């Protein structure tokens, strides 16, 4: 089943040997996801899932090498016998070609039927285990699928796509929003299908189309500006799915180096170009263990936002969240509050829907925990500045503005009384001397002939442009306004 030009690159005895298989599989016209997932899953298994080395399995061997930092003598790596890997490959292909026969699916020149796709879906879905928790670590790869029958939400969609490559269908692709996955197919790839569940609730919309989710302006579907992958992008997803977590507090060094390198490989090949979140991941990695001759983290977060604006209508939230994080961690309040505001600037043209819970919680943390903690910390650093810059006060206000606009036209209310206490308290974190140097203008003349300024977009935030700029923050009042 495997091509000879792939076999020769085996076996893999180090992170580098693995990179070779990826750099070489990435140079073909149809990179093999099934092969690359198996390798990755295999590697991630002995490195993160089961680190104790079996001495009774003459078929499984490990490779010694000098350990990275002065700490330690020798490190062991799971050698990827060609035999083992090829055996799994064949087992996967058997399940597929043996559970679906293209005998009855006339494809009119390079397209796949909605019935075929929905079939390959079902094949994989019914192949799934009955007894397991859907949120556990290290069940993203096909290695997991074939070995223990366990796959997580996104992993299922990846499987369905890999399965189709195995059947020859080269029009079926992975579709990636920021919190979901489904499949795109058809001529020009404009037909879509739901293949996996979402959130805790096993509620699936399988066989249904995304059109309804895109229509309702929810963030799960990104107002139609979600990623449409190609073989190369799907390989990136895979690299980003690598989970280096050994434990809640421990991480696998080798798996981190591995994933970091494979992202660069993908970057140099330019395949990260349309994958903002990938740029983010790569960034965060670097911050911790930088590599010589490579750009700074900060450089990367921006290349990530650039991508968002260019190829996705700047409709993605995470590239800002990523950046805001970097600063917050690096204690740069000004720059942080800026990005969090930029975030709300995107979310404002959305609606908070049932399935958008994940992003809700992401703002809730920022609004109610993270920010009130940079401010609390700031009120102690000057006493022994930024807590006295109006522009920061504007950033905070603009942030709340976006969250208010978001709520507008929404099914479920965003704001409740609990949001207020931390708005009130964060306002009080700024001296009236400053809260008044911010110009809350609505509009001088529009168009053009031939302190800092701030204009609200939300009717809620507009009605309060006065209470926010008082010398005494009317607690009771701002509450009853924020919620309505």
């Amino acid at each position: 089943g495997l091509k000879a030009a792939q076999k020769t690159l085996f076996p893999l005895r180090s992170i580098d040997d693995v990179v070779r298989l990826f750099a070489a599989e990435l140079g073909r016209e149809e990179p093999d996801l099934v092969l690359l997932s198996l390798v990755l899953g295999f590697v991630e298994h002995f490195l993160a899932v089961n680190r104790v080395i079996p001495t009774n399995v003459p078929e499984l061997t490990f490779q010694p090498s000098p350990a990275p930092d002065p700490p330690g003598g020798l490190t062991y790596f799971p050698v990827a016998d060609l035999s083992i890997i090829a055996a799994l490959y064949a087992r996967f292909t058997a399940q597929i070609r043996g559970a679906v026969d293209l005998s009855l699916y006339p494809r009119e020149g390079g397209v796949s039927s909605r019935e075929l796709v929905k079939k390959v879906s079902d094949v994989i879905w019914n192949s799934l285990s009955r007894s397991y928790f859907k949120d556990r670590a290290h069940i993203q790869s096909l290695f997991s699928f074939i070995t223990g029958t366990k796959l997580d939400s996104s992993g299922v969609a990846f499987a369905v796509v890999g399965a189709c490559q195995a059947l020859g269908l080269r029009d079926v692709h992975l579709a990636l929003s920021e919190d979901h996955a489904w499949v795109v197919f058809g001529p020009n790839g404009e037909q879509t299908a739901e293949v996996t569940w979402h959130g805790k609730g096993n509620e699936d919309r399988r066989g249904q189309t995304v059109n309804a989710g895109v229509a309702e302006r929810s963030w799960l579907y990104l107002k139609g500006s979600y990623m449409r992958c190609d073989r190369k992008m799907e390989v990136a997803f895979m690299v980003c799915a690598i989970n280096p977590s050994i434990d809640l507090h421990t991480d696998s060094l080798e798996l981190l180096q591995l994933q970091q390198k494979l992202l660069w490989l993908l970057y140099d090949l330019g395949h990260l170009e349309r994958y903002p979140m990938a740029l983010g991941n790569l960034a965060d990695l670097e911050e911790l263990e930088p590599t010589p001759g490579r750009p700074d983290p900060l450089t990367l977060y921006h290349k990530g936002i650039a991508s968002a604006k260019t190829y996705y209508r700047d409709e993605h939230i995470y590239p800002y969240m990523y950046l805001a994080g970097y600063h917050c961690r690096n204690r740069n309040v000004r720059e942080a509050l800026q990005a969090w505001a930029d975030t709300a600037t995107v979310i404002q043209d959305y609606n908070y829907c049932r399935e958008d819970e994940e992003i809700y919680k992401e703002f809730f943390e920022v609004a109610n925990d993270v920010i009130p903690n940079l401010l609390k910390e700031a009120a102690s650093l000057l006493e022994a500045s930024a807590l006295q810059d109006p522009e920061c006060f504007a950033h905070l206000l603009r942030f709340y503005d976006g969250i208010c606009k978001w709520e507008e036209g929404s099914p479920t209310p965003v704001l409740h009384v609990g949001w207020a206490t931390f708005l009130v308290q964060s306002l009080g974190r700024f001296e009236g001397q400053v809260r008044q140097k911010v110009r809350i203008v609505s509009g001088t003349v529009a168009g053009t002939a031939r302190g800092p300024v701030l204009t609200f977009q939300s009717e809620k935030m507009k009605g309060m442009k006065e209470l926010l700029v008082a010398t005494k923050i009317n607690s009771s009042a701002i509450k009853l306004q924020l919620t309505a």
Binding site: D135, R136, A137, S154, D179, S245, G280, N281, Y318, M321
Partner: peptide, 9 residues
């Protein structure tokens, strides 16, 4: 991290 959507921040 047990499981978060791939490439999430």
């Amino acid at each position: 991290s047990r499981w978060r959507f791939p490439a999430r921040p």
